[PDB]
Design a protein around this ligand. Structure first.
Ligand SMILES: *[C@@H]1O[C@H](CO)[C@@H](O[C@@H]2O[C@H](CO)[C@@H](O)[C@H](O)[C@H]2NC(C)=O)[C@H](O)[C@H]1NC(C)=O
Lengths: 50, 49
């Protein structure tokens, strides 16, 4: 009888962990573009005159 | 004229090449060499000018 009750917890916790991991991919793809813009500004405004 | 956009140094030209799922740019740049020391001045004065 405890198998049926443990599976209900396993399914929920897996869902929650995988939601966490999707939203981190989507947030990291946005931090990546900001850092790519910062790297271009360091080249074009600090080591040059734009 | 964007610094570092087309390689390191003063961009002269670039050539494309195809790759399996991409592209390779060959960047030709000018890099100055063998610098010497000198004395400078902002302006010269001559005839009060
Ligand atoms: C221009 O002159 C400066 C100052 O004279 C040179 O700077 C030297 O740098 C070395 C580093 O290896 C120090 O050990 C010396 O004390 C510095 N002064 C000297 C040698 O007088 C600099 O190297 C010169 N630049 C060029 C391109 O020759």
């Amino acid at each position: 009888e405890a198998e049926v009750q443990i599976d209900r917890l396993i399914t929920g916790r897996l869902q929650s962990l995988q939601t966490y991991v999707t939203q981190q991919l989507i947030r990291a793809a946005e931090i990546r573009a900001s850092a790519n813009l910062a790297a271009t500004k360091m080249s074009e405004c600090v080591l040059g005159q734009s | 004229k964007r610094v570092d956009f087309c390689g390191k140094g003063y961009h002269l030209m670039s050539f494309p090449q195809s790759a399996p799922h991409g592209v390779v740019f060959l960047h030709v740049t000018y890099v100055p060499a063998q610098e010497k020391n000198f004395t400078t001045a902002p302006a010269i004065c001559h005839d009060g000018k």
